[PDB]
Design a protein around this ligand. Structure first.
Ligand SMILES: *[C@@H]1O[C@H](CO)[C@@H](O[C@@H]2O[C@H](CO)[C@@H](O[C@@H]3O[C@H](CO)[C@@H](O)[C@H](O)[C@@H]3O)[C@H](O)[C@H]2NC(C)=O)[C@H](O)[C@H]1NC(C)=O
Ligand code: NAG
Ligand code: NAG
Length: 276
Protein backbone atom coordinates (compact mmCIF):
# COMPACT_ATOMS: atom_id res chain seq x y z
CA UNK A 1 0.00 0.00 0.00
CA UNK A 2 0.91 3.70 -0.16
CA UNK A 3 -0.82 3.91 3.27
CA UNK A 4 1.01 3.38 6.56
CA UNK A 5 0.40 0.56 9.02
CA UNK A 6 0.51 0.88 12.81
CA UNK A 7 -1.33 -2.25 13.88
CA UNK A 8 -1.22 -4.96 11.15
CA UNK A 9 -4.60 -5.87 9.56
CA UNK A 10 -6.13 -3.43 12.15
CA UNK A 11 -5.01 0.21 11.93
CA UNK A 12 -4.22 2.23 8.84
CA UNK A 13 -3.26 5.84 8.37
CA UNK A 14 -3.92 6.96 4.84
CA UNK A 15 -3.42 10.60 5.63
CA UNK A 16 -2.11 13.26 3.23
CA UNK A 17 -1.66 10.77 0.34
CA UNK A 18 -3.56 12.71 -2.35
CA UNK A 19 -6.47 10.22 -2.76
CA UNK A 20 -9.44 11.10 -4.92
CA UNK A 21 -11.33 7.99 -3.91
CA UNK A 22 -11.66 5.65 -0.93
CA UNK A 23 -8.83 3.06 -1.01
CA UNK A 24 -9.62 -0.64 -1.29
CA UNK A 25 -6.26 -2.42 -1.27
CA UNK A 26 -6.75 -2.72 2.50
CA UNK A 27 -7.86 -5.65 4.77
CA UNK A 28 -11.63 -6.17 5.02
CA UNK A 29 -11.14 -6.72 8.77
CA UNK A 30 -9.72 -3.16 9.24
CA UNK A 31 -10.95 -1.56 12.47
CA UNK A 32 -9.35 1.93 12.41
CA UNK A 33 -8.98 4.05 9.27
CA UNK A 34 -7.60 7.60 9.06
CA UNK A 35 -8.24 9.11 5.62
CA UNK A 36 -8.00 12.78 6.63
CA UNK A 37 -6.33 15.24 4.22
CA UNK A 38 -7.25 13.72 0.85
CA UNK A 39 -9.22 15.42 -2.01
CA UNK A 40 -12.08 12.91 -1.53
CA UNK A 41 -14.61 15.67 -2.42
CA UNK A 42 -17.79 13.58 -2.66
CA UNK A 43 -19.25 10.67 -0.71
CA UNK A 44 -21.52 8.63 -2.96
CA UNK A 45 -23.57 5.66 -1.74
CA UNK A 46 -21.67 2.60 -0.42
CA UNK A 47 -18.42 4.62 -0.17
CA UNK A 48 -17.22 2.23 2.57
CA UNK A 49 -18.52 -1.14 1.36
CA UNK A 50 -15.09 -2.79 1.74
CA UNK A 51 -14.72 -2.22 5.53
CA UNK A 52 -17.86 -3.65 7.18
CA UNK A 53 -15.85 -4.01 10.40
CA UNK A 54 -14.64 -0.38 10.92
CA UNK A 55 -14.87 1.10 14.40
CA UNK A 56 -13.23 4.52 13.99
CA UNK A 57 -13.10 6.60 10.81
CA UNK A 58 -11.38 9.93 10.15
CA UNK A 59 -12.36 12.16 7.21
CA UNK A 60 -11.04 15.52 8.53
CA UNK A 61 -10.40 18.24 5.94
CA UNK A 62 -11.24 15.98 2.95
CA UNK A 63 -12.99 18.79 0.95
CA UNK A 64 -16.27 16.83 1.07
CA UNK A 65 -19.27 18.89 -0.05
CA UNK A 66 -21.90 16.21 -0.55
CA UNK A 67 -22.78 13.05 1.34
CA UNK A 68 -25.55 10.85 -0.13
CA UNK A 69 -27.98 8.13 1.01
CA UNK A 70 -26.01 5.20 2.43
CA UNK A 71 -22.41 6.47 2.15
CA UNK A 72 -21.84 4.61 5.44
CA UNK A 73 -24.55 2.01 4.81
CA UNK A 74 -22.55 -1.03 5.91
CA UNK A 75 -20.78 0.37 8.96
CA UNK A 76 -22.89 -1.37 11.62
CA UNK A 77 -20.01 -1.22 14.11
CA UNK A 78 -18.86 2.39 13.65
CA UNK A 79 -18.47 4.07 17.05
CA UNK A 80 -16.62 7.22 15.99
CA UNK A 81 -16.93 9.37 12.86
CA UNK A 82 -14.77 12.48 12.48
CA UNK A 83 -15.91 14.82 9.72
CA UNK A 84 -14.18 17.95 10.98
CA UNK A 85 -13.65 20.84 8.53
CA UNK A 86 -15.47 19.83 5.35
CA UNK A 87 -17.38 22.53 3.40
CA UNK A 88 -20.47 20.32 3.36
CA UNK A 89 -23.35 21.92 1.44
CA UNK A 90 -25.78 19.26 0.27
CA UNK A 91 -26.39 16.68 2.96
CA UNK A 92 -28.72 13.85 1.97
CA UNK A 93 -31.69 13.21 4.26
CA UNK A 94 -30.33 9.66 4.81
CA UNK A 95 -26.57 10.24 4.82
CA UNK A 96 -26.04 8.64 8.25
CA UNK A 97 -27.91 5.46 7.35
CA UNK A 98 -26.43 2.22 8.70
CA UNK A 99 -24.43 3.88 11.46
CA UNK A 100 -26.37 1.70 13.90
CA UNK A 101 -23.69 1.65 16.60
CA UNK A 102 -22.44 5.28 16.28
CA UNK A 103 -21.35 6.78 19.59
CA UNK A 104 -19.18 9.83 18.89
CA UNK A 105 -19.90 12.15 15.94
CA UNK A 106 -17.56 15.08 15.24
CA UNK A 107 -19.10 17.60 12.82
CA UNK A 108 -16.85 20.52 13.75
CA UNK A 109 -16.45 23.42 11.28
CA UNK A 110 -18.60 21.67 8.65
CA UNK A 111 -20.52 24.77 7.61
CA UNK A 112 -23.54 24.02 9.86
CA UNK A 113 -25.98 26.94 10.26
CA UNK A 114 -28.88 25.20 12.03
CA UNK A 115 -29.28 21.77 13.65
CA UNK A 116 -32.66 21.41 11.98
CA UNK A 117 -31.46 19.87 8.71
CA UNK A 118 -29.05 17.59 10.56
CA UNK A 119 -30.04 13.94 9.77
CA UNK A 120 -28.94 12.25 13.01
CA UNK A 121 -32.38 11.48 14.42
CA UNK A 122 -32.13 7.73 13.86
CA UNK A 123 -28.77 7.63 15.69
CA UNK A 124 -30.21 6.37 19.00
CA UNK A 125 -26.80 5.20 20.18
CA UNK A 126 -25.24 8.69 20.05
CA UNK A 127 -23.47 9.68 23.29
CA UNK A 128 -21.61 12.75 22.09
CA UNK A 129 -22.10 15.24 19.24
CA UNK A 130 -19.49 17.96 18.69
CA UNK A 131 -20.65 20.80 16.47
CA UNK A 132 -18.27 23.47 17.69
CA UNK A 133 -16.91 26.16 15.31
CA UNK A 134 -19.86 26.19 12.90
CA UNK A 135 -22.19 28.99 11.83
CA UNK A 136 -25.10 28.31 14.16
CA UNK A 137 -26.85 31.51 15.28
CA UNK A 138 -30.11 30.17 16.64
CA UNK A 139 -29.39 27.03 18.63
CA UNK A 140 -32.70 25.31 18.87
CA UNK A 141 -32.65 21.58 19.40
CA UNK A 142 -35.26 20.19 16.98
CA UNK A 143 -37.77 17.51 17.77
CA UNK A 144 -35.56 14.65 16.57
CA UNK A 145 -33.56 15.07 19.80
CA UNK A 146 -36.15 12.78 21.44
CA UNK A 147 -34.47 9.71 19.99
CA UNK A 148 -31.04 10.75 21.27
CA UNK A 149 -31.96 8.94 24.47
CA UNK A 150 -28.24 8.29 25.13
CA UNK A 151 -26.82 11.76 24.42
CA UNK A 152 -24.52 13.01 27.17
CA UNK A 153 -22.21 15.68 25.79
CA UNK A 154 -23.37 18.29 23.34
CA UNK A 155 -20.78 20.85 22.28
CA UNK A 156 -22.04 24.05 20.67
CA UNK A 157 -19.03 26.27 21.36
CA UNK A 158 -17.53 28.89 19.03
CA UNK A 159 -20.65 29.22 16.90
CA UNK A 160 -22.46 32.49 16.20
CA UNK A 161 -25.03 31.93 18.99
CA UNK A 162 -26.29 35.22 20.45
CA UNK A 163 -29.35 34.28 22.51
CA UNK A 164 -30.86 31.47 24.49
CA UNK A 165 -34.64 31.54 24.12
CA UNK A 166 -37.10 29.38 26.06
CA UNK A 167 -38.09 27.16 23.12
CA UNK A 168 -34.41 26.34 22.47
CA UNK A 169 -34.13 23.58 25.05
CA UNK A 170 -37.83 22.61 25.16
CA UNK A 171 -37.50 19.01 23.83
CA UNK A 172 -35.54 18.04 26.94
CA UNK A 173 -38.71 18.26 29.11
CA UNK A 174 -39.68 14.76 27.94
CA UNK A 175 -36.12 13.47 28.33
CA UNK A 176 -36.15 12.68 32.10
CA UNK A 177 -33.19 10.22 32.09
CA UNK A 178 -30.94 12.82 30.40
CA UNK A 179 -27.59 13.27 32.05
CA UNK A 180 -26.51 16.00 29.61
CA UNK A 181 -23.35 18.11 29.61
CA UNK A 182 -23.86 21.20 27.42
CA UNK A 183 -20.99 23.34 26.14
CA UNK A 184 -21.88 26.86 24.95
CA UNK A 185 -18.56 28.72 25.43
CA UNK A 186 -17.01 31.24 23.07
CA UNK A 187 -20.35 32.19 21.59
CA UNK A 188 -21.15 35.88 21.09
CA UNK A 189 -23.94 35.51 23.65
CA UNK A 190 -25.27 38.51 25.54
CA UNK A 191 -28.87 37.57 26.40
CA UNK A 192 -30.65 34.70 28.18
CA UNK A 193 -34.43 34.97 28.15
CA UNK A 194 -36.05 34.19 31.54
CA UNK A 195 -37.31 30.59 31.94
CA UNK A 196 -34.90 29.22 29.32
CA UNK A 197 -33.61 26.57 31.76
CA UNK A 198 -36.73 25.81 33.86
CA UNK A 199 -37.79 22.15 34.24
CA UNK A 200 -34.64 20.91 32.38
CA UNK A 201 -32.02 18.37 33.49
CA UNK A 202 -28.39 19.44 32.99
CA UNK A 203 -25.44 17.62 34.51
CA UNK A 204 -22.94 20.27 33.35
CA UNK A 205 -23.40 23.73 31.75
CA UNK A 206 -20.74 26.00 30.20
CA UNK A 207 -21.52 29.64 29.55
CA UNK A 208 -18.06 31.13 29.75
CA UNK A 209 -16.23 33.54 27.41
CA UNK A 210 -19.47 34.78 25.97
CA UNK A 211 -20.57 38.39 26.50
CA UNK A 212 -22.99 38.02 29.39
CA UNK A 213 -23.35 41.12 31.58
CA UNK A 214 -26.38 39.88 33.45
CA UNK A 215 -28.73 36.91 33.75
CA UNK A 216 -32.41 36.91 34.66
CA UNK A 217 -33.46 36.20 38.23
CA UNK A 218 -34.10 32.53 38.92
CA UNK A 219 -32.48 31.51 35.65
CA UNK A 220 -30.96 28.43 37.36
CA UNK A 221 -33.22 28.08 40.43
CA UNK A 222 -35.04 25.06 39.03
CA UNK A 223 -32.12 23.34 37.30
CA UNK A 224 -32.03 19.60 38.14
CA UNK A 225 -28.83 17.69 38.91
CA UNK A 226 -26.49 20.48 37.83
CA UNK A 227 -23.01 19.42 38.95
CA UNK A 228 -20.67 21.85 37.24
CA UNK A 229 -21.11 25.32 35.76
CA UNK A 230 -18.71 27.77 34.09
CA UNK A 231 -19.31 31.50 34.10
CA UNK A 232 -15.81 33.01 33.99
CA UNK A 233 -14.55 35.50 31.38
CA UNK A 234 -17.83 37.34 30.99
CA UNK A 235 -18.29 41.14 31.28
CA UNK A 236 -20.43 40.84 34.45
CA UNK A 237 -22.17 44.04 35.43
CA UNK A 238 -21.84 44.16 39.23
CA UNK A 239 -24.18 47.06 39.89
CA UNK A 240 -26.68 46.41 42.68
CA UNK A 241 -29.35 45.19 42.71
CA UNK A 242 -28.83 43.76 39.19
CA UNK A 243 -26.10 41.34 40.29
CA UNK A 244 -27.91 40.39 43.53
CA UNK A 245 -29.34 37.05 42.30
CA UNK A 246 -26.26 35.66 40.56
CA UNK A 247 -24.09 36.72 43.50
CA UNK A 248 -26.42 34.93 45.88
CA UNK A 249 -26.55 31.85 43.68
CA UNK A 250 -22.79 31.55 43.28
CA UNK A 251 -22.39 31.46 47.08
CA UNK A 252 -25.26 29.04 47.51
CA UNK A 253 -23.68 26.92 44.72
CA UNK A 254 -19.94 27.40 45.28
CA UNK A 255 -19.11 23.69 44.88
CA UNK A 256 -20.60 23.65 41.39
CA UNK A 257 -18.72 26.70 40.02
CA UNK A 258 -15.63 26.22 37.88
CA UNK A 259 -13.28 29.18 37.84
CA UNK A 260 -14.70 32.46 39.11
CA UNK A 261 -17.08 34.97 37.58
CA UNK A 262 -15.46 38.37 37.97
CA UNK A 263 -16.89 41.88 37.71
CA UNK A 264 -16.18 43.96 34.62
CA UNK A 265 -13.98 46.91 35.56
CA UNK A 266 -13.58 45.74 39.16
CA UNK A 267 -12.14 42.25 38.53
CA UNK A 268 -13.56 41.21 41.91
CA UNK A 269 -15.39 37.86 42.10
CA UNK A 270 -19.14 38.08 41.61
CA UNK A 271 -19.68 35.80 44.62
CA UNK A 272 -18.04 38.47 46.80
CA UNK A 273 -20.78 41.09 46.33
CA UNK A 274 -23.40 41.63 49.01
CA UNK A 275 -26.16 43.90 47.73
CA UNK A 276 -28.37 46.00 49.99
C1 LIG B 1 -28.95 9.62 34.32
O1 LIG B 1 -29.42 9.76 35.66
C2 LIG B 1 -30.63 9.03 35.87
C3 LIG B 1 -31.47 9.55 37.04
O2 LIG B 1 -30.68 9.72 38.19
C4 LIG B 1 -30.26 7.56 36.00
O3 LIG B 1 -31.40 6.80 36.40
C5 LIG B 1 -31.07 5.82 37.42
O4 LIG B 1 -30.81 4.55 36.83
C6 LIG B 1 -30.29 3.59 37.74
C7 LIG B 1 -29.81 2.43 36.88
O5 LIG B 1 -28.66 2.84 36.18
C8 LIG B 1 -31.36 3.21 38.77
O6 LIG B 1 -30.86 2.29 39.74
C9 LIG B 1 -31.62 1.05 39.83
O7 LIG B 1 -32.14 0.79 41.15
C10 LIG B 1 -31.45 -0.05 42.08
C11 LIG B 1 -30.63 0.83 43.02
O8 LIG B 1 -31.52 1.40 43.95
C12 LIG B 1 -30.60 -1.16 41.44
O9 LIG B 1 -30.63 -2.33 42.22
C13 LIG B 1 -31.08 -1.45 40.02
O10 LIG B 1 -30.36 -2.53 39.43
C14 LIG B 1 -30.91 -0.17 39.20
O11 LIG B 1 -29.52 0.07 39.04
C15 LIG B 1 -31.88 4.48 39.46
O12 LIG B 1 -33.04 4.16 40.19
C16 LIG B 1 -32.16 5.67 38.49
N1 LIG B 1 -32.38 6.96 39.16
C17 LIG B 1 -32.36 7.22 40.47
C18 LIG B 1 -31.44 8.32 40.93
O13 LIG B 1 -33.04 6.63 41.31
C19 LIG B 1 -29.69 7.13 34.63
O14 LIG B 1 -28.98 5.92 34.78
C20 LIG B 1 -28.78 8.15 33.91
N2 LIG B 1 -29.01 8.03 32.47
C21 LIG B 1 -28.11 8.32 31.51
C22 LIG B 1 -28.59 8.12 30.10
O15 LIG B 1 -26.97 8.72 31.73
C1 NAG C 1 -37.18 4.49 11.31
C2 NAG C 1 -38.53 5.07 11.63
O1 NAG C 1 -39.04 5.89 10.87
N1 NAG C 1 -39.12 4.65 12.75
C3 NAG C 1 -39.61 5.52 13.82
C4 NAG C 1 -38.44 6.17 14.59
O2 NAG C 1 -38.88 7.34 15.23
C5 NAG C 1 -37.80 5.23 15.61
O3 NAG C 1 -36.62 4.73 15.03
C6 NAG C 1 -38.71 4.05 15.98
C7 NAG C 1 -38.28 3.28 17.25
O4 NAG C 1 -38.17 4.10 18.39
O5 NAG C 1 -40.07 4.47 16.02
C8 NAG C 1 -40.59 4.75 14.73
C1 NAG D 1 -3.75 -10.60 8.94
O1 NAG D 1 -4.95 -11.35 9.05
C2 NAG D 1 -5.22 -12.15 7.91
C3 NAG D 1 -6.69 -12.58 7.88
O2 NAG D 1 -7.08 -13.16 9.10
C4 NAG D 1 -4.23 -13.31 7.91
O3 NAG D 1 -4.44 -14.14 6.78
C5 NAG D 1 -2.80 -12.78 7.90
O4 NAG D 1 -1.92 -13.83 8.25
C6 NAG D 1 -2.55 -11.57 8.82
N1 NAG D 1 -1.38 -10.85 8.32
C7 NAG D 1 -0.18 -10.89 8.89
C8 NAG D 1 0.79 -11.94 8.42
O5 NAG D 1 0.15 -10.09 9.76
Amino acid sequence: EPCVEVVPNITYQCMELNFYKIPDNLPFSTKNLDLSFNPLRHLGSYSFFSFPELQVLDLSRCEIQTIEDGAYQSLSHLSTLILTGNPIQSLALGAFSGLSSLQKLVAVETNLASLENFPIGHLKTLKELNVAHNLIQSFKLPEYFSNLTNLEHLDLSSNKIQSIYCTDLRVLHQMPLLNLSLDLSLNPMNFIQPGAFKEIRLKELALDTNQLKSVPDGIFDRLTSLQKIWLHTNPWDCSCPRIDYLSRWLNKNSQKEQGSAKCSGSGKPVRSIICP
